[PDB]
Amino acid sequence: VTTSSYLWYYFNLVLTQIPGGQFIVSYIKKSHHDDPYRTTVEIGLILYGIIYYLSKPQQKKSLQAQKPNLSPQEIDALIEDWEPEPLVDPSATDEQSWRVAKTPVTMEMPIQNHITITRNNLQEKYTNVFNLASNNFLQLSATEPVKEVVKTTIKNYGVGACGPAGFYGNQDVHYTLEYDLAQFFGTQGSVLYGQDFCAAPSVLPAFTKRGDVIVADDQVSLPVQNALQLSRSTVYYFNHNDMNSLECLLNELTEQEKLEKLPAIPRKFIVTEGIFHNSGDLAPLPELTKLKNKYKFRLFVDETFSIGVLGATGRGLSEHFNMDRATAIDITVGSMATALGSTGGFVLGDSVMCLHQRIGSNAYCFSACLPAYTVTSVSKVLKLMDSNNDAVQTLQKLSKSLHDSFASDDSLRSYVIVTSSPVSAVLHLQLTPAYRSRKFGYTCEQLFETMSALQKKSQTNKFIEPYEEEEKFLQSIVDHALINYNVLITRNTIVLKQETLPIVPSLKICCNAAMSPEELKNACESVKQSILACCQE
Amino acid sequence: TTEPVKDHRRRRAAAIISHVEPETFEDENDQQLLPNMNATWVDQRGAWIIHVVIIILLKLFYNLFPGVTTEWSWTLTNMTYVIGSYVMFHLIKGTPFDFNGGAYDNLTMWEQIDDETLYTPSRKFLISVPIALFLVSTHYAHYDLKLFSWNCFLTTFGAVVPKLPVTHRLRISIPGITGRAQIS
Amino acid sequence: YTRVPLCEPEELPDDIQKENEYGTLDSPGHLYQVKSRHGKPLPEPVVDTPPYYISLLTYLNYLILIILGHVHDFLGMTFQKNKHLDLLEHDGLAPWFSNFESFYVRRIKMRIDDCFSRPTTGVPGRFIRCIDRISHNINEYFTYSGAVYPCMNLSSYNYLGFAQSKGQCTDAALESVDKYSIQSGGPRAQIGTTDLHIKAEKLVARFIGKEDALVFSMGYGTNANLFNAFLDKKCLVISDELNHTSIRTGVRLSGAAVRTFKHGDMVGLEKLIREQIVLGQPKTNRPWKKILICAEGLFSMEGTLCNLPKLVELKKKYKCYLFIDEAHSIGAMGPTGRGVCEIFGVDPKDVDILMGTFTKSFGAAGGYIAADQWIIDRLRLDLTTVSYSESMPAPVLAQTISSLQTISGEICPGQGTERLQRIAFNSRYLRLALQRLGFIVYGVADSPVIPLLLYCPSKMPAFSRMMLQRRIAVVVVAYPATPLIESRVRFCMSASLTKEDIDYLLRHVSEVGDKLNLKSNSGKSSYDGKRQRWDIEEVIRRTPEDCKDDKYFVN
Amino acid sequence: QHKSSMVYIPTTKEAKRRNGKSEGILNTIEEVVEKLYWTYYIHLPFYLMASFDSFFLHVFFLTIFSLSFFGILK
Numbered sequence A: 001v002t003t004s005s006y007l008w009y010y011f012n013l014v015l016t017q018i019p020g021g022q023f024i025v026s027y028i029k030k031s032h033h034d035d036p037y038r039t040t041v042e043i044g045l046i047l048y049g050i051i052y053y054l055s056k057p058q059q060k061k062s063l064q065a066q067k068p069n070l071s072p073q074e075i076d077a078l079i080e081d082w083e084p085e086p087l088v089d090p091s092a093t094d095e096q097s098w099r100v101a102k103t104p105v106t107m108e109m110p111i112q113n114h115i116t117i118t119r120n121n122l123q124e125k126y127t128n129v130f131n132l133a134s135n136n137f138l139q140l141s142a143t144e145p146v147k148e149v150v151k152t153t154i155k156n157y158g159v160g161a162c163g164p165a166g167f168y169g170n171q172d173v174h175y176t177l178e179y180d181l182a183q184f185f186g187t188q189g190s191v192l193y194g195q196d197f198c199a200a201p202s203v204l205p206a207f208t209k210r211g212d213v214i215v216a217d218d219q220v221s222l223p224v225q226n227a228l229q230l231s232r233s234t235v236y237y238f239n240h241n242d243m244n245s246l247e248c249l250l251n252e253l254t255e256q257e258k259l260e261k262l263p264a265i266p267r268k269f270i271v272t273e274g275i276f277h278n279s280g281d282l283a284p285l286p287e288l289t290k291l292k293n294k295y296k297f298r299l300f301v302d303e304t305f306s307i308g309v310l311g312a313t314g315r316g317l318s319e320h321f322n323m324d325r326a327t328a329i330d331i332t333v334g335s336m337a338t339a340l341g342s343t344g345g346f347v348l349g350d351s352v353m354c355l356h357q358r359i360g361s362n363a364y365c366f367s368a369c370l371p372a373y374t375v376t377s378v379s380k381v382l383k384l385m386d387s388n389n390d391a392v393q394t395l396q397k398l399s400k401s402l403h404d405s406f407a408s409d410d411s412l413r414s415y416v417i418v419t420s421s422p423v424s425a426v427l428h429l430q431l432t433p434a435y436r437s438r439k440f441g442y443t444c445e446q447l448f449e450t451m452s453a454l455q456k457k458s459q460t461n462k463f464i465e466p467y468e469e470e471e472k473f474l475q476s477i478v479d480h481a482l483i484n485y486n487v488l489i490t491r492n493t494i495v496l497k498q499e500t501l502p503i504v505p506s507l508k509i510c511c512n513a514a515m516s517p518e519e520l521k522n523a524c525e526s527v528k529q530s531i532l533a534c535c536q537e
Numbered sequence B: 001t002t003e004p005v006k007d008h009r010r011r012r013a014a015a016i017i018s019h020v021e022p023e024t025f026e027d028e029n030d031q032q033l034l035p036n037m038n039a040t041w042v043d044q045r046g047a048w049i050i051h052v053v054i055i056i057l058l059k060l061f062y063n064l065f066p067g068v069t070t071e072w073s074w075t076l077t078n079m080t081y082v083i084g085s086y087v088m089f090h091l092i093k094g095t096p097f098d099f100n101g102g103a104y105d106n107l108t109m110w111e112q113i114d115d116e117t118l119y120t121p122s123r124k125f126l127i128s129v130p131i132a133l134f135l136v137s138t139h140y141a142h143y144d145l146k147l148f149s150w151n152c153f154l155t156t157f158g159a160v161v162p163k164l165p166v167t168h169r170l171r172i173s174i175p176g177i178t179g180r181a182q183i184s
Numbered sequence C: 001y002t003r004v005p006l007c008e009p010e011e012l013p014d015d016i017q018k019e020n021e022y023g024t025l026d027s028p029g030h031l032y033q034v035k036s037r038h039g040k041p042l043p044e045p046v047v048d049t050p051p052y053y054i055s056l057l058t059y060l061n062y063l064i065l066i067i068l069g070h071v072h073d074f075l076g077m078t079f080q081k082n083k084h085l086d087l088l089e090h091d092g093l094a095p096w097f098s099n100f101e102s103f104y105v106r107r108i109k110m111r112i113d114d115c116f117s118r119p120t121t122g123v124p125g126r127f128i129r130c131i132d133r134i135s136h137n138i139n140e141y142f143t144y145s146g147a148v149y150p151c152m153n154l155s156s157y158n159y160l161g162f163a164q165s166k167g168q169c170t171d172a173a174l175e176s177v178d179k180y181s182i183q184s185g186g187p188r189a190q191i192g193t194t195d196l197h198i199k200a201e202k203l204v205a206r207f208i209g210k211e212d213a214l215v216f217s218m219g220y221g222t223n224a225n226l227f228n229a230f231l232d233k234k235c236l237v238i239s240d241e242l243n244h245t246s247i248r249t250g251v252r253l254s255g256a257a258v259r260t261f262k263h264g265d266m267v268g269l270e271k272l273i274r275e276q277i278v279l280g281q282p283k284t285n286r287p288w289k290k291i292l293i294c295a296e297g298l299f300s301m302e303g304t305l306c307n308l309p310k311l312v313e314l315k316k317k318y319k320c321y322l323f324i325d326e327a328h329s330i331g332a333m334g335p336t337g338r339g340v341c342e343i344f345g346v347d348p349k350d351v352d353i354l355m356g357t358f359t360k361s362f363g364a365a366g367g368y369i370a371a372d373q374w375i376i377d378r379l380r381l382d383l384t385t386v387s388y389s390e391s392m393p394a395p396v397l398a399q400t401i402s403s404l405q406t407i408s409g410e411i412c413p414g415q416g417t418e419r420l421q422r423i424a425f426n427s428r429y430l431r432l433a434l435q436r437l438g439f440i441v442y443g444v445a446d447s448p449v450i451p452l453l454l455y456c457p458s459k460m461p462a463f464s465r466m467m468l469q470r471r472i473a474v475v476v477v478a479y480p481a482t483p484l485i486e487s488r489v490r491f492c493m494s495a496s497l498t499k500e501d502i503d504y505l506l507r508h509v510s511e512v513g514d515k516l517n518l519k520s521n522s523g524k525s526s527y528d529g530k531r532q533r534w535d536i537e538e539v540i541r542r543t544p545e546d547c548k549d550d551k552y553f554v555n
Numbered sequence D: 001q002h003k004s005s006m007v008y009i010p011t012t013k014e015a016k017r018r019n020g021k022s023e024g025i026l027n028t029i030e031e032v033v034e035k036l037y038w039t040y041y042i043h044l045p046f047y048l049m050a051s052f053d054s055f056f057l058h059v060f061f062l063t064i065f066s067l068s069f070f071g072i073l074k
């Protein structure tokens, strides 16, 4: 070997850079000369104490390439020639101005079955319309006993709390609701959140980290997508309700992990939901439970539209299939504004997860608590719903008749299709892939590939022409239905530039439990005629 | 086989000597977003003298025993500090509290000090203390060949060699002693 | 009997319960008016230090607790493992969390847990009523026995004292429950927008001074879902190191490159900007698309202002955009309660985007953003909370209309001024007296948040326990959120407390501090340059008439 | 403007003055002993620990002072 050669330059170049090295080494020599062993050990340690101290700061290597060969004259020129971009581009702000000028506004009345609307800054006024776009399905918050509980809570507790959940904010009435929800749905406990849209992005990242694995559905709503992005963990996908694909994917992951010989097994999850927000069909539970038990996976179900619509009483998907929520589902995320009738959201699970959630959840620790009258009003509705179950029976009966009326027809077979389920309370309609081509000349795959490439390249302007034409055509059908007949229906409002998964414009009709069979039957016929008149010509 | 849409897969080692791979764009933003709390207290007030105080107290406490000779009292306090320093700085990997995404979960505390910047004052102080302690101990109390040899081979391979800039971001894997390290 | 009991409402005549919630003024000499700071730069802050041995003792204590803490768990989980089934694998399923990630909450915070969360019943006025519990095991579970004792509070957020149960605001809310209901229609983009929402949007816009405004339903929701609308992988965001969590969650979701700068340095920022513009994007060396500067109107932990006159000049020389958050200053600071844009005299059109919430001052949950015209039009369509989330109820909105008008001076003649001078006077009086007794306090001489520093770790739980018996409520923080050396207790003033309660507060805190050896001051705190230790009677007799003058305050 | 619903705990000084305490021979030790019974206790981390650990720590401080002090004489 020749390793000794380089060490010589080092310790000679070290001593010459040091202002005096010959003398100090000579002094150490003569004082400890008995045995060389000693003199070697101390000549070393002190000197690298000196050389390391005398050195200069050194910065790490980053991605950005340094430019140390630039004089100050250049740096003043480069900084002056810079030209930024506008904060938000005003290039195409007028093209999408119709969607904000068509928003109906209600005038000095509660959102009920019969309201009065005006559109486009008080330019046009329509009176005594039939509402079919409301998102509440039971209408129990409008009864007298709920109102009296609200007024008394307001008088004795004021309007809103003024402290975070941490200390002063949680109060006696809060805890009462948590005990009450847990008892009603058969879970050990529950946690209240400020807003439903901030529930999934605030609980999923708490239990998920890098190195985990998550298996999610082919198409899910936006909040689920935001939760997956913030999770920072590997994410797979499987076809929409295809158990063979789920089995094949789970078999592959397990075999690879066994062969890996890893010390500590990571956390695994399965993410799906109940009645889908965009499609509105039902997910099979028994297959999911049997698969999660054999392959050792945890289950996560996000039911929002099925809390008060499914089952013989209104306890959700678990009751509908005749199972128990304690062992079937690990984590449940729901909402209160859709069915119960007040703002907020909650999470259901066993005791251990709730305890970890009180400290490790960002939306709960660093935010204020809900107002008092919201909590008391919901607790009253839960007690009323448990006492009697007539509203749920009526809602289920109307939903079945509505879907049967629009899906048993024959003359709309070449224009629209139904993509819902008989148990769902909202009916969605789309256009057949053949008719859309004849008037716009594009398909779903071409739209998805165009937008994905557009997002990846990070262009400053995002605009698709055929997609805008389909939206304008759908809005034309809605406007025609309202002008000639007093029926108000809405279209599925989406923001395309925020979506990652394939999606297509649609049209939806709502319902609730306070209508009558005669009124709903006539609204069905009027919408049928409106769809034909615009399309046939 | 199939690969995921978003992949954050930790990778093990395949060689005896391996280096933690440089982080990507997403990892860089996570680390830079939040100032760290493990390595912040090194620069704070009164965080340099405390090492001098601990050495003094340990020497007095060990000297309190009646039957201990001055040679073995120095060796004991050198043993306690070197072992204690190595455990705290170079052994526990990651962060105690919850850092976002667990980005700081493959580096030690020493390489986490002052944003991986080298040759900073704090690193100058912490590498200059044990050298002084070993020099004063071996000059103050006369040692034989066996004890001088042993204490040297603790001081060097325990307090100086790990802290050197060369050994930065280096992981040693032996098929039996330590498990396959996390390289990414 | 193991649950939190549901408390009954106390019964009394009308006059008695109008004095529990909002105390009347003693004398007309207890009012002060704020003056503008136009044309004067902001001096660098001055900080105080305690002697060396206090810091040395704190390091020794944490070292002892940490060493003892790890030892307990290793012996437990390795040898006696049948009482810890919730931290080990059970038949093929990984545990919910790991030991290291939870080494702090279990082992250094559990013993002090009785102070942190307290059940309360009643309206949070100037006296707050608390239920009683008795601690079992070591804070494993709590037993409740059914009594109520009032306590004076310094924790709740009612700056201007709108948290009342009998008055004009509550009359307007009760009338709404008849005309409207408590149910929201749905997403604002399809159905659920009423004229009430439009009126509040216009009123907020006129009040703050910008051209137009939008209204949301959660302060966390407002900030978290805002940044991804106009940022991408090609942008750069420069943010302070002491900002709120809601802002940070918006940025990490957006994905833009993030660079941070040390707090309070207006030089190192300039070195950061000149460097970043020249370097450009990574791995490609191309110019940045846009540069954004984020800051905060007032920091709660430190209680120091942001130098807006400097930031406005910097955002003009280098062509950078600016973003400001005023949640704790919108309604209670400035000469006429409008915010940082008023106290510093800067024109409102210089800032690009404004933000705020309603909880802290006006007394309702919500939030607003204000910007120019074309900025709002694009954001009304690019945002996701408008089209997917829910809408806010009516009673929360009805109060916000009947409060933004009182302070503005329309519905009530002379109550806004008589609610913006009192909070100014109290903050001036408490801060000067505590500095004179000998404590160490931070602030900017006007912030309602007054932090007091306690350094030793055992001294914090003792101080908190000792004063709930003395009938006063406080809140404390610890290492996971503050530096290792510096721990503090935080005070929140209100417009209801009067001079007498401050006197009653000052006497008790004086005796407690003397027992625990808490007054460790120096000459840097005072203005003459010499240490001071005054008697309690001299402080109470002289301070109320000397707090109005400015020359006595160091900063 | 002079009626509320809070009961005022009297200050620590006030209680003694009412009950009639104004004496001072062994009277100046009850209080001086109590003052010494807070300096030692507070600065050490005694509240955050457990009963078994605090028992060992108290014993440790006693023996260390004893050995240091008696060895001073001998």
Ligand SMILES: C[C@@H]1CC[C@@]2(OC1)O[C@H]1C[C@H]3[C@@H]4CC=C5C[C@@H](OCCC(CO[C@H]6O[C@H](CO)[C@@H](O[C@H]7O[C@H](CO)[C@@H](O)[C@H](O)[C@H]7O)[C@H](O)[C@H]6O)CO[C@H]6O[C@H](CO)[C@@H](O[C@H]7O[C@H](CO)[C@@H](O)[C@H](O)[C@H]7O)[C@H](O)[C@H]6O)CC[C@]5(C)[C@H]4CC[C@]3(C)[C@H]1[C@@H]2C
Pocket (backbone or CB within 6 Å): A211, A264, B087, B091, B092, B093, B094, B102, B105, B182, C070, C073, C074, C077, C078, C098, C100
């Ligand atoms: C004078 C006399 C004699 C001398 C004496 O006094 C008296 O001297 C006294 C002085 C004492 C020492 C004082 C201080 C320490 C340091 C401490 O430091 C903890 C460090 C913690 C964090 O460290 C890890 O951090 C990450 C998370 O684990 C790891 O990486 C991640 O990477 C990715 C991140 O996302 C993901 O993949 C994963 O998250 C993960 O992989 C990383 O590799 C690793 O560093 C870990 O601590 C735990 O480690 C074990 C596993 O968790 C615990 O469980 C296991 O412990 C035993 C294991 O065989 C068995 O019982 C069972 O199997 C099972 O129970 C164990 O209980 C406990 O120690 C460990 C104990 C020690 C040496 C004490 C020992 C006892 C003495 C020698 C006394 C002594 C009595």
Ligand SMILES: CCCCCCCCCCCCCCCCCCCCCCCCCC(=O)N[C@@H](CO)[C@H](O)[C@H](O)CCCCCCCCCCCCCC
Pocket (backbone or CB within 6 Å): B038, B041, B050, B051, B054, B079, B080, B081, B083, B084, B085, B087, B088, B092, B096, B109, C059, C062, C063, C066, C067, C484
């Ligand atoms: C052959 C074998 C012979 C056996 C002989 C026995 C020797 C006994 C060795 C004892 C070693 C004990 C070392 C314990 C260290 C464990 C610490 C692990 C904690 C992990 C936390 C990671 C990040 C937190 C860091 C942090 O914030 N730290 C700070 C607190 O917050 C930090 O703690 C403080 O500021 C103080 C820094 C004082 C520095 C002085 C070190 C000198 C050596 C002391 C050893 C004591 C040995 C006792 C026997």
Ligand SMILES: CC(C)[C@@H](C)/C=C/[C@@H](C)[C@H]1CC[C@H]2C3=CC=C4C[C@@H](O)CC[C@]4(C)[C@H]3CC[C@]12C
Pocket (backbone or CB within 6 Å): A003, A006, B156, B157, B161
């Ligand atoms: C007490 C132990 C730790 C001592 C003896 C070991 C130190 C190591 C780190 C030193 C000793 C010799 C050094 C050494 C020998 C030879 C060469 C070849 C030369 O072209 C570059 C430097 C290089 C590669 C260095 C690397 C670092 C080495 C291997």
Ligand SMILES: CC(C)[C@@H](C)/C=C/[C@@H](C)[C@H]1CC[C@H]2C3=CC=C4C[C@@H](O)CC[C@]4(C)[C@H]3CC[C@]12C
Pocket (backbone or CB within 6 Å): B017, B157, B166
């Ligand atoms: C008993 C133990 C403590 C002894 C054997 C330990 C010695 C280790 C630390 C030494 C021995 C050889 C050294 C060594 C060998 C080879 C190389 C490759 C070279 O390119 C850089 C230095 C490097 C990476 C160093 C690192 C430190 C090593 C691995």
Ligand SMILES: CC(C)[C@@H](C)/C=C\[C@@H](C)[C@H]1CC[C@H]2C3=CC=C4C[C@@H](O)CC[C@]4(C)[C@H]3CC[C@]12C
Pocket (backbone or CB within 6 Å): A007, A010, A040, A041, A044, A045, A048, B156, B160, B161, B164, B166
């Ligand atoms: C020389 C013996 C007695 C040892 C134990 C004493 C001191 C050690 C710590 C010193 C002596 C020589 C030093 C030394 C030799 C050569 C090199 C190669 C160079 O490219 C980097 C520094 C490096 C790697 C340093 C590391 C620290 C060493 C190895």
Ligand SMILES: *Cc1c(COP(=O)(O)O)cnc(C)c1O
Pocket (backbone or CB within 6 Å): A366, A367, A368, C218, C219, C220, C244, C246, C325, C327, C328, C357, C358, C359, C365, C366, C367
């Ligand atoms: C209080 C806090 C929030 C919290 O918003 P809420 O509507 O009260 O939940 C938002 N922003 C800032 C700056 C805060 O301090």
